[PDB]
Scaffold this active site. Structure first.
Site, mmCIF file in Angstrom:
data_model
loop_
_atom_site.group_PDB
_atom_site.id
_atom_site.type_symbol
_atom_site.label_atom_id
_atom_site.label_comp_id
_atom_site.label_asym_id
_atom_site.label_seq_id
_atom_site.Cartn_x
_atom_site.Cartn_y
_atom_site.Cartn_z
ATOM 1 C CD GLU A 12 -43.988 -2.563 -101.001
ATOM 2 O OE1 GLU A 12 -44.994 -3.334 -101.191
ATOM 3 O OE2 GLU A 12 -43.810 -1.519 -100.672
ATOM 4 C CG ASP A 13 -45.125 -8.837 -100.908
ATOM 5 O OD1 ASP A 13 -45.469 -9.470 -99.841
ATOM 6 O OD2 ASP A 13 -45.624 -7.784 -101.434
#
Ligand SMILES: [Mg+2]
Ligand SMILES: [Zn+2]
Ligand SMILES: [Zn+2]
Ligand SMILES: [Zn+2]
Lengths: 34, 67, 256, 98, 98, 44, 477, 528, 115
Positions: G204-205
């Site tokens: 994800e981030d």
RNA sequence: AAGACCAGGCU
């Protein structure tokens, strides 16, 4: 007489002169002084 | 603020090279030649002296609160 | 069926740096050795700090953080010192700590650089390694007085106990085992250990080969000599294995 | 007290006529970073209400070229209504046409 | 004496005006600080530029449901002296008569 | 008690009910010396 | 126009406009008009010449400046509705020349096209290689990047001040950061960033961080909290007196014990203060006493940095106290580059577990490659390559937006001269097993920012706490 | 007034009866943890120390409850309160009170939340009933909530400063309800569209594809590691596909051990051409691009988003329908763990060389752009000399815009196709797009070839100035450059006018995102 | 708040056994070794040494969670040989190799430091 | 206490 493709130095020199004279907050100071 | 003691990546001491780096740069070495002279081979130690900003000089202008 | 018979060549040996080659051994062996180079080698570093007066522009734990990163000559007495968790005493003694004292005042006008040279220890073997390492700068009228005790630890605890300034590690410089796959082999610079001509990019594929020479380059931070870093790491890894053999002998004896 | 109140609270007008006045002016200066301080000192506000679902006044107009930063606006209900000044932009202070 | 007017920092009437680096450091003032804010009750307050429609110029618009097909207007002010914000409208009624 | 002045940097002797002016310079800002009791830091 | 350019009786702030089709001529001296400077073009030639540039280069000790440049008729201020009658050239060397003849009536020329950006958008390296939403995100996030906000912060008594230990100026810089003074007060650290999928904790981030680097002072900072308090001695005051309360003499009393307080009821600086500790012992003499003492914010766990005693507007005793705490970056803390790539710290690995190059370099930050393809932040990659070139060259790279003298092929050719793969890829070894990684990972130094948002300031839990007075429901906040 | 007290939002009815603030709730930042199960959540100790669950004393648990009471509130696991049969609520947190620490059947001990507890976990925009699923507590250090990454897409959550709410049921009955109704494995398939909600996302999907290609041959130690990371493994090493030269296993051969039970499924890879089904090689696909799973063995094929993703008839959906919720959970967890641990060997990355194309491809793209611009010039010249005939039902302006848009769209599509054809098999952009993990063919086209036309309110860039877009252009200029067509790519960089036009284009998207939410929420509330 | 202390990476407390041995019921002649407060440094070494034994059928290790400091090793051997014996033999072989490597490294250092 | 305004964050 014309700037012979030295332009990258020339335009940043004049920008440096502008920001050396004015700065970033002149709109605040000029308005209040006036 | 002030030069970090260790390079963060590898751990080499760069805390004793700031004054020498400044002296060389004043003595007309370029940054690349000065870093080579100081013995900083890989880019992780070079960035330490190359990107450091010494604010401690600015902080020393203000008078202390001590007598 | 049976254990390795490795061999060592040493190419370069200085006060900063040790280049050596280990042949005829497993890759896991080599990786664990280079990993123990960082995290399991004991050294001496400042851990307890008490500040009496600090009128500098850097705060107390800022100065304490810098003090812990200053390397100390650990060459001799790190085998003689105990861990503080091992030691029998409730407070700091010469068998488990080293005392440092700092007392600097800037009376003169020109700025004074407080360096590691200003640290004074109770015993002569364990000076700071070191221009010198700059701790803080003092304006006129500013003062810095503190006490510090140094303990024994290793890299797992904190990076201040890392004895090393980066370990280079490499095997199979010419990509014969194909552990990495170059999409374009012609674009990649050749290793300083490459044994092939200027014209060819990679060695031919070796289906029967296994990783076999490990090239090393251990660079010391100054606390321990790079020659003794490797010896201490090997001894520590052997001691860890012997401690498992010992306690696993007891766990089999429980299972019996 | 009139100047002090209108600069402290931010309500721009008579304190008894605060229902009739304009609000939002004279916020507390942002000191989180030097860039934040500069951006706060160089900032423009559209008086159009924030509840307005009309998209038109929020869009980046052609005439903002060189005057107002195209990249810098807050995200949320104030998209396109709070605008920052370009580096070389200068606001006229006015003069008499005598 | 009729009152006290707050002073914008580093303006022509501020005490920091024309001071050098040494003077600002002696005064415990950062030279890099641009000024352009006020100090009210110890807090720093910054006036935000307020966008508004221009005055004394004739504009012509249309809006869909109004009785008028076209609405000309002129928000007028006398040189920002005695300002009433008087607006005249001059509108054209729609064609749709019956 | 002792406080340090915010301009002349001298010590001044004072008690809890006293109004603040510095005895050397009239200035109205004071700082309390770091205490004498010790605080232990880890160098981590 | 001649009189305006000679500054004779028309101030340069006055705008003049001729609308030819409607036969109107409009002159505005009004205030509030926004305008920007432009170079005058006469025929096909600039009025700015080499003597002006020589004098401006010798600007020091010559009292020749931008006002003298304006007075010479070289530059002109133009507002919005005068631009409608202006024919602008983007650059002189490109658009004045006899190319194929698009236009020949150019009347003005821009100083530099990068002047269209604001203060916060001028710190982005290569902003024309990114998506505009990402540029906007970076412009918004740059105001939250931590650093040294003002040099005299040790004097200021401000609430919620954040300061970073070791700020660094970017290795890849914009020409306009010199005028924003970003060198003098930087807001981040150059870090070796490897774009790879290592253990799934950066998906994800998220970001993997190097714990060994963090132990060396990487992205370490200080948080200062200020507390205001006073004797309140006016009107219906009685007095509200600074004093050290005795254990059961006052009415209000709690398991918080006062014994860190001094004689005047104020903690001296240098005293470690934790949750519930009383920083200021203030007692009301009440018609027989009430404790109105102030406490720390829960779990703040700081140290008293400065204590100040003054007299307010009224002239009663008034006290400020500043508390500091150091906060070492943890898993929940938020980190961001200069391109809109924001992320928390998924996990921290020591130096032994991090992947390493042949030279022993280990990345400080590892980011997921999946953040790049959809967000389309190529300026991040170009910055990463340029910083790798600059750290070896000893120079600081130039990432001003619209300069044709920098391109990716030239940066690659420069990097290839230092013994590295020209596209920035590098062979990495697995930290756990020592085996080579089959793919070659893109690595290099990138400028990263620590943000104000930390998990320690956001974590919260509730079980039968305070109850709202009117609804008898749990409190808000 | 009273009307104002009762009327609006935060008024009595809506703000205090339909919704209200609750006890036993926690909030903090969420961080990924691929080592957790799909129904587990990582909980910090401080939150678990604050949060309590009341438990009834009975002869089975009296010893454990007495141990918790002697640990008390100081040490982590103990009790905070003891509640008597009369309702008297002894508090352990301030004083030891050794006479009151006695326990008997009927008392209630409020212990600290431990491993195995059931909690509802929530993310705030709360759009469907999978936004609140019951999780199983695992206690971890540091201060962030941790959850598996396949669970992210149900919550629409990403790990960028996101916080999530934690609700702890306080009674056995409500605990039983959450366990039996709202557990994460019971919510795999949504009734909304009869599709699975959770899927394989991010690193794991790209690693699935690269692992399940034909070229993956795994050595003995690598096989033993991957089997060490299997939870449902029976303990028998399968016979390798290749025996004599050396023993070599295949990625499909180990993926077949991940696949549970005996599952029969047939899908097609994303890169599957339609030519293979017509002629020969129907059942021996040369590109490896049809998927056949028989008897729970993956016989042929490359897996991708169309096989492990959230779609009707997917492998995960069929696994759920055949095996039930309990086995599908282990199927997700095993895929995650074993393929992350294999990806530790091969690695994945993205870089500049992934975005740089061939010099011949660049020339082809430039030729296409020049031809398109020349065609738009010739169309403009046709309209200028009044030779353009207006299309039925359309204005002259409308047909002129339609023709220009057609030309530019054809140009952008052709350049994108050329850029996609120029990609190598090692390109990481292609490796991410083909597997469907993230990115797309239009993203590749914009990165490498041409950013494309910029549009404002679905139209080409308007004339904000009198008869022109910017003061750099001449009046009445309808060419592609003047009206917002971006000729360059992101790698090459944009000119100043194209940059401003792209900023105008992105502003519209930002505004739409900021505006649509209120109307959508108001519609949702009225429907409910 | 929740940051664990620096020492859970390397140090045991009351009640923790350095090694725990559990038999694996899925497959005959299979055992499961749990090593507390260790990491990859030792697990990779032991696995690599065990894979050389011709009588070992399976050998693998893993870290169940990086935030925890724990190693699990699974060893399956042929019928007439105990995985406990395989583990002890691997440890002894590793120690024997390391001692020889240390001696040869010392000899190399002494040869390097003169001529 | 409570009310008000403002700023920012995640969709
Ligand atoms: Mg998010
Ligand atoms: Zn380094
Ligand atoms: Zn001792
Ligand atoms: Zn004084």
């Amino acid at each position: 007489e014309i700037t012979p493709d030295l332009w990258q130095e020339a335009c940043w020199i004049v920008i440096s002169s502008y920001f050396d004279e004015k700065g970033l907050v002149r709109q605040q100071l000029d308005s209040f002084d006036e | 603020m002030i030069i970090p003691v260790r390079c963060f990546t590898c751990g080499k001491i760069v805390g004793n090279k700031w004054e020498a780096y400044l002296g060389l740069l004043q003595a007309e070495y370029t940054e690349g030649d000065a870093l080579d002279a100081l013995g900083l081979k890989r880019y992780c130690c070079r960035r330490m002296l190359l990107a450091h900003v010494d604010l401690i000089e600015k902080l020393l202008n203000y008078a202390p609160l001590e007598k | 069926p049976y254990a390795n018979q490795p061999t060592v060549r040493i190419t370069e040996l200085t006060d900063e740096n040790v280049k050596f080659i280990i042949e005829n051994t497993d890759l896991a062996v080599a990786n664990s050795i280079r990993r123990v180079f960082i995290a399991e080698v004991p050294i001496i570093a400042i851990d307890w700090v008490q500040i009496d007066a600090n009128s500098s522009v850097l705060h107390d734990e800022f100065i304490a953080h810098r003090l812990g990163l200053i390397p100390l000559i650990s060459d001799d007495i790190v085998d003689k010192l105990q861990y503080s968790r091992d030691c029998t005493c409730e407070e700091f003694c010469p068998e488990c700590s080293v005392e440092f004292t700092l007392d600097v005042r800037c009376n003169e006008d020109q700025t004074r650089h407080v360096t590691s040279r200003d640290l004074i220890s109770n015993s002569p073997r364990v000076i700071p390694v070191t221009d010198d390492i700059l701790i803080v700068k003092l304006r006129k009228g500013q003062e810095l007085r503190l006490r510090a005790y140094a303990k024994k630890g290793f890299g797992k605890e904190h990076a201040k106990w890392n004895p090393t300034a980066g370990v280079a590690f490499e095997y199979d410089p010419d990509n014969a085992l194909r552990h990495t796959v170059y999409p374009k082999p012609e674009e990649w610079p050749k290793s300083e250990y490459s044994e092939l001509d200027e014209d060819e990019s990679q060695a031919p594929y070796d289906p029967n080969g296994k990783p076999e020479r490990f090239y090393y380059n251990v660079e010391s931070c100054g606390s321990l000599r790079p020659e003794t870093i490797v010896l201490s790491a090997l001894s520590g890894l052997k001691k860890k294995l012997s401690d498992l053999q010992t306690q696993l002998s007891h766990e089999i004896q429980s299972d019996v | 007290d009139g100047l002090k109140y209108s600069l402290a609270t931010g309500n721009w007008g008579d304190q008894k006529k605060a229902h009739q006045a304009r609000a939002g002016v004279s916020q507390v200066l942002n000191r989180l970073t030097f860039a934040s301080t500069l951006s706060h000192l160089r900032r423009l506000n559209s008086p159009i209400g924030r509840d307005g679902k009309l998209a038109k006044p929020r869009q980046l107009h052609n005439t903002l070229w060189g005057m107002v930063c195209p990249a810098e606006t807050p995200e949320g209900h104030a998209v396109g209504l709070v605008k920052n000044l370009a580096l070389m932009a200068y606001i006229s202070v006015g003069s008499q046409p005598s | 004496f009729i009152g006290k007017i707050p002073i914008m920092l580093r303006s022509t009437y501020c005490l920091l005006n024309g001071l050098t680096d040494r003077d600002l450091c002696e005064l415990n003032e950062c030279p890099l600080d641009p000024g352009g804010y006020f100090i009210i009750n110890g807090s720093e307050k910054v006036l935000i530029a307020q966008e508004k429609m221009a005055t004394n110029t004739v504009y012509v618009f249309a809006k869909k449901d109004s009785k008028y097909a076209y609405t000309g207007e002129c928000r007028s002010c006398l040189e920002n002296s005695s300002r009433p914000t008087s607006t005249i409208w001059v509108s054209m009624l729609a064609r749709g008569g019956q | 008690m002792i406080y340090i002045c915010g301009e002349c940097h001298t010590e001044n002797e004072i008690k809890s009910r006293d109004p603040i002016r510095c005895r050397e310079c009239g200035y109205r800002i004071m700082y309390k010396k770091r205490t004498k009791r010790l605080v232990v830091f880890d160098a981590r | 126009r001649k009189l305006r350019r000679q500054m004779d009786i028309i101030v340069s702030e006055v705008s003049m406009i001729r609308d030819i089709r409607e036969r109107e001529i409009r002159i505005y001296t009004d205030a509030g008009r926004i305008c920007r400077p432009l170079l005058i073009v006469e025929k096909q030639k600039l009025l700015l010449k080499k003597r002006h540039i020589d004098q401006l280069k010798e600007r020091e000790y010559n009292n020749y400046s931008w006002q003298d440049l304006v007075a010479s008729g070289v530059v002109e201020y133009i507002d919005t509705l005068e631009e409608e009658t202006v024919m602008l050239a983007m650059t002189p060397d490109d658009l004045q020349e006899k190319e194929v003849a698009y236009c020949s009536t150019y009347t003005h020329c821009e100083i530099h096209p990068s002047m269209i950006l604001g203060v916060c958008a001028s710190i982005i390296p290569f902003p024309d290689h990114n998506q505009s939403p990402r540029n906007t995100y970076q412009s918004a996030m740059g105001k939250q990047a931590m650093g040294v906000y003002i040099t005299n912060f040790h004097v200021r008594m401000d609430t919620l001040a954040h300061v970073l230990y070791y700020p660094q100026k970017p290795l890849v810089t914009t020409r306009s950061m010199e005028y924003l003074r970003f060198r003098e007060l930087p807001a981040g650290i150059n870090s070796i960033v490897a774009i790879a999928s290592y253990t799934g904790y950066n998906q994800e981030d998220s970001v993997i961080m190097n714990r060994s680097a963090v132990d060396r002072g990487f992205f370490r900072s200080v948080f200062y909290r200020s507390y205001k308090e006073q004797e309140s001695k006016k009107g219906f005051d009685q007095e509200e007196v600074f004093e050290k309360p005795t254990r059961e003499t006052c009415q209000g009393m709690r398991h918080a014990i006062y014994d860190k307080l001094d004689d005047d009821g104020l903690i001296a600086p240098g005293v470690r203060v934790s949750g519930d500790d009383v920083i200021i012992g203030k007692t009301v003499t009440l018609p027989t006493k009430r404790d109105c003492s102030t406490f720390l914010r829960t779990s703040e766990t700081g140290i008293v940095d400065q204590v100040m005693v003054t007299l307010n507007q009224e002239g009663y005793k008034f006290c400020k106290i500043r508390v500091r705490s150091v906060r070492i970056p943890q898993i929940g803390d938020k980190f961001a580059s200069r391109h809109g790539q924001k992320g928390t710290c998924g996990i921290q690995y020591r130096q032994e577990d991090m992947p390493f190059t042949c030279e022993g370099i280990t990345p400080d930050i590892i980011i997921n490659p999946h953040a790049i393809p959809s967000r389309m932040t190529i300026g991040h990659l170009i910055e990463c390559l340029q910083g790798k070139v600059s750290a070896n060259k000893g120079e600081i790279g130039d990432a001003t937006p619209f300069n044709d003298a920098v391109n990716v092929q030239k940066i690659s050719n420069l990097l290839s001269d230092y013994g590295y793969h020209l596209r920035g890829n590098e062979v990495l070894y697995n930290g756990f097993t020592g085996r080579k990684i089959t793919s070659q990972i893109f690595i290099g130094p990138t400028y990263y920012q620590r943000l104000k948002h930390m998990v320690d300031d956001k974590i919260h839990s509730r079980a039968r706490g305070p109850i709202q007075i009117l609804n008898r429901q749990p409190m808000e906040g | 007034s009273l009307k104002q007290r009762l009327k609006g939002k935060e008024g009595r009815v809506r703000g205090n009866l339909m919704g209200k603030r609750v006890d036993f709730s926690a909030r903090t930042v969420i961080t990924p943890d691929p080592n957790l199960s799909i129904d587990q959540v990582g909980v910090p100790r401080s939150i678990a120390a604050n949060m309590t669950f009341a438990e009834i004393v009975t002869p089975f648990n009296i010893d454990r409850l007495q141990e918790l009471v002697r640990r008390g509130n100081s040490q982590y696991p103990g009790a905070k309160y003891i509640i008597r049969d009369n309702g008297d609520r002894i508090d352990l947190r301030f004083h030891p009170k050794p006479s009151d620490l006695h326990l008997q059947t009927g008392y209630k001990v409020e212990r600290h939340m431990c491993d195995g507890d059931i909690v509802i976990f929530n993310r705030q925009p709360t759009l469907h009933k999978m936004s609140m699923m019951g999780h199983r507590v695992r206690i971890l250090p540091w201060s962030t909530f941790r959850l598996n990454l396949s669970v992210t897409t149900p919550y629409n959550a990403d790990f960028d400063g996101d916080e999530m709410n934690l609700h702890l049921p306080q009674s056995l009955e409500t605990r039983a309800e959450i366990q039996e109704l709202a557990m994460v494995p019971r919510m795999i398939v949504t009734p909304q569209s009869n599709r699975p909600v959770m899927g394989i996302v991010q690193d794991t999907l790209t690693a699935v594809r690269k692992f399940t290609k034909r070229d993956v041959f795994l050595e003995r130690g690598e096989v033993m590691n991957l089997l060490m990371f299997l939870s449902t493994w029976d303990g028998k090493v399968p016979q390798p596909a290749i025996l004599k030269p050396r023993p070599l296993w295949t990625g499909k051969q180990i993926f077949s051990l991940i696949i549970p039970g005996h599952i029969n499924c047939i899908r097609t890879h994303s890169t599957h051409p339609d030519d293979e089904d017509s002629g020969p090689y129907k059942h021996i696909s040369p590109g490896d691009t049809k998927v056949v799973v028989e008897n729970g063995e993956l016989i042929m094929g490359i897996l991708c988003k169309k096989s492990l993703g959230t779609s009707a008839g997917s492998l995960v959906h069929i696994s759920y329908l055949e095996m039930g919720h309990d086995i599908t959970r282990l199927f997700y967890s095993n895929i995650q763990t074993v393929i992350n641990n294999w990806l530790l060997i091969e690695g994945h990355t993205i870089g500049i060389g992934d975005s740089i194309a061939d010099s011949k491809t660049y020339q082809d793209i430039q030729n296409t752009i020049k031809k398109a611009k020349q065609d738009v010039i010739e169309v403009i010249e046709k309209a200028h000399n009044n030779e353009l005939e207006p299309t039925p039902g359309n204005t002259l302006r409308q047909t002129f815009e339609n023709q220009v848009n057609r030309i530019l769209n054809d140009a952008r599509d052709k350049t994108g196709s050329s850029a996609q054809k120029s990609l190598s098999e090692y390109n990481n952009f292609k490796s991410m797009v083909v597997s469907g993990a993230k990115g797309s063919k239009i993203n590749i086209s914009q990165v490498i070839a041409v950013v494309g036309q910029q549009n404002v309110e679905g139209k080409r860039i308007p004339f904000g100035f009198k008869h022109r877009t910017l003061p750099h252009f001449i009046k009445d200029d309808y060419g592609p450059e003047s009206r917002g067509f971006v000729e360059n790519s992101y790698l090459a960089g944009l000119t100043p006018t194209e940059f401003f036009f792209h900023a105008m284009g992105g502003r519209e998207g930002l505004i739409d995102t900021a505006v649509k939410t209120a109307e959508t929420g108001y519609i949702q509330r009225r429907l409910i | 708040m929740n940051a664990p202390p620096a020492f859970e990476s390397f140090l045991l407390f009351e009640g923790e056994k350095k090694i725990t041995i559990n038999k694996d019921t899925k497959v005959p002649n299979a055992c499961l070794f749990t090593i507390n407060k260790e990491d990859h440094t030792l697990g990779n070494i032991i696995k690599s040494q065990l894979l050389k034994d011709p009588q070992v059928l399976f050998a693998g290790y893993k870290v169940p969670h990086p935030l925890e400091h724990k190693i699990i090793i699974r060893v399956q051997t042929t019928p007439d040989y105990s995985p406990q014996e395989a583990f002890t033999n691997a440890i002894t072989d590793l120690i024997s190799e390391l001692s020889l490597l240390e001696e040869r490294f010392r000899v190399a250092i002494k040869d390097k430091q003169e001529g």
